[PDB]
Amino acid sequence: ECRYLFGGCKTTSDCCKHLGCKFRDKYCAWDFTFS
Helix, strand or coil, X not given: CCECCCCCCCXXXXXCCCEEECCCCXXXXXXXXXX
16 A cells, blocks of 8 residues: 555555655655655
């Protein structure tokens, strides 16, 4: 399920688009392109 900003993600492939799961916070933080 696309875990928007601050969405519990088990991995990077568990978040929305512009978001990326970082092995640390457990949530989904922006990550896609230079912005």
